[PDB]
């Protein structure tokens, strides 16, 4: 048998809309992800077990369930790991959720329809949006192959190692598939052992886990005295958390008093954590948790809660309403049907930032080259130096990232 264990790796699937990206992880996981449910945590999301057929041949020993008849033993196959996909469905250009999601994937997947010419506007937008966010395991997939001769493919492959020339995805591989009618779904899964390995992981760090989610889970009619702690739901990016420990989460609840805005830690136990419909003892990173608390519902409901981390109790974590940049910026913006460039930042200027799940604005009181320094409209919680931050611009009416950078302490 294989074990029911939580997911080890977030991996985003992103890419023109229409490309195929939700079509792609239902081939491989079996599931849908808009919508699915039940459940909320939002976005697409969906697991799936990734196992090998030991006697049989790659790729096609690759199996997404614990049989190896396909390539023809009764045999049980080995288990390699349980892993998640992200996916933003939809409306895109919206995405202060692609900077959430951002900070949850292990590595990547590129979604190119292969019936149209590459690279398409929001194709050349996400290849940037991915270094900008830095991650970068990337597998580039080749969708709808089917609907184009092994020629007209052959031509867009060369186009793409082309554009990625001299890139940092220079290496990235090129996996030619149909999401559609599932053609070569276990090249992709083996590229995906192959090119996204489950990073090192260190259990020892502090817990954190941004949160991506809150609800109230108790459903109407709920007699009082079963009412349930709220839920926070999110991913854990370091460190591991257990069934009753002591957590808080940052920068926490809001306070009026009744003009100077502030804000305190919200401490709580955690009551539950799942996984699916799994439930478990412990949460490491990967995959998306939902974790139960004995929180007022209020303060969880309706994702009142989105952006925060979670830290134990205990832990020493800065909330800062000012911070530090080291950052780099893009020359050019994508921006309109035209290459767009970037003006350096201009003091008093105010800039969004991401930091972690939180997406919050601020005003910029220092400019130097490679450093900057903003007045935060609200504090965020800082729970170590390493972290990458997105800077991003209003250009033309809408929220556009004009560059990347590490928080300073
Ligand atoms: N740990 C834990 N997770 C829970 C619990 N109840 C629900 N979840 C998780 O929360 C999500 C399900 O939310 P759901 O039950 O749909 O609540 P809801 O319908 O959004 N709330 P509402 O009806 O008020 O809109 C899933 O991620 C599920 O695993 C619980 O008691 N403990
Ligand atoms: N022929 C073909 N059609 C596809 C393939 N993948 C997706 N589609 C179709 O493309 C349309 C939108 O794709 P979808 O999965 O929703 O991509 P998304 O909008 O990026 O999430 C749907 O009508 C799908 O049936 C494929 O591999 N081959």
Redesign the pocket.
């Given at each position: 048998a294989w074990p029911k264990v939580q997911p080890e790796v977030n991996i985003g699937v992103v890419g023109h809309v229409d490309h195929g990206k939700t079509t792609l992880v239902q081939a491989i996981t079996g599931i849908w992800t808009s919508k699915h449910?039940?459940?909320?945590?939002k976005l697409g999301y969906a697991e799936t077990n990734i196992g090998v057929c030991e006697s049989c041949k790659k790729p096609e020993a690759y199996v997404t369930e614990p049989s190896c008849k396909s390539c023809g033993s009764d045999d049980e196959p080995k288990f390699l790991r349980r892993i998640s996909f992200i996916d933003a469905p939809g409306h895109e250009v919206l995405m202060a959720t692609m900077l959430s999601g951002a900070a949850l994937m292990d590595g990547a997947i590129l979604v190119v329809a292969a019936n149209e010419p590459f690279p398409q506007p929001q194709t050349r937008e996400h290849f940037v949006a991915l270094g900008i966010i830095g991650v970068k395991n990337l597998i580039i997939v080749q969708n709808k192959v089917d609907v184009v001769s092994k020629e007209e493919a052959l031509s867009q492959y060369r186009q793409i190692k082309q554009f990625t020339k001299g890139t940092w995805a220079e290496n990235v591989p090129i996996i030619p598939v149909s999401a559609l009618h599932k053609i070569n779904i276990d090249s992709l899964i083996e590229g995906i052992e192959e090119y996204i390995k489950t990073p090192y992981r260190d259990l020892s760090q502090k817990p954190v886990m941004l949160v991506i989610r809150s609800?109230?889970?108790?459903?109407?009619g709920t007699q009082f005295n079963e009412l349930?702690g709220g839920?926070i739901?999110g991913s854990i990016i370091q460190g591991l958390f257990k069934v009753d420990q002591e957590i808080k989460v940052l920068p926490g609840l809001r306070v009026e008093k009744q003009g100077k805005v502030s804000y305190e830690p919200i401490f709580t136990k955690i009551?539950?954590?799942?996984f699916?419909?799994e439930?478990f003892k412990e949460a490491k990173p990967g995959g998306?948790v939902?974790?139960?608390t004995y929180l007022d519902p209020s303060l969880t409901?309706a994702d009142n809660l989105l952006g925060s981390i979670i830290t134990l109790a205990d832990a020493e974590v800065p909330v800062l309403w000012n911070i530090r940049i080291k950052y780099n910026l893009l020359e050019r913006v994508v921006g309109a049907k035209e290459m767009l460039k970037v003006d350096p930042i201009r003091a008093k200027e105010t800039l969004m930032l991401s930091v972690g799940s939180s997406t919050t604005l601020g005003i910029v009181t220092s400019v130097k080259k490679d450093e900057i320094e903003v007045e935060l409209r609200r504090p965020v919680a800082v729970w170590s130096n390493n972290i990458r931050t997105v800077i991003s611009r209003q250009i033309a009416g809408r929220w556009r990232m004009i560059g990347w950078g590490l928080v300073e302490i």
């Open positions: 449910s039940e459940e909320t945590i609800f109230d889970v108790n459903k109407p349930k839920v739901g009551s539950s954590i799942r699916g419909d439930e998306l939902a974790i139960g409901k």
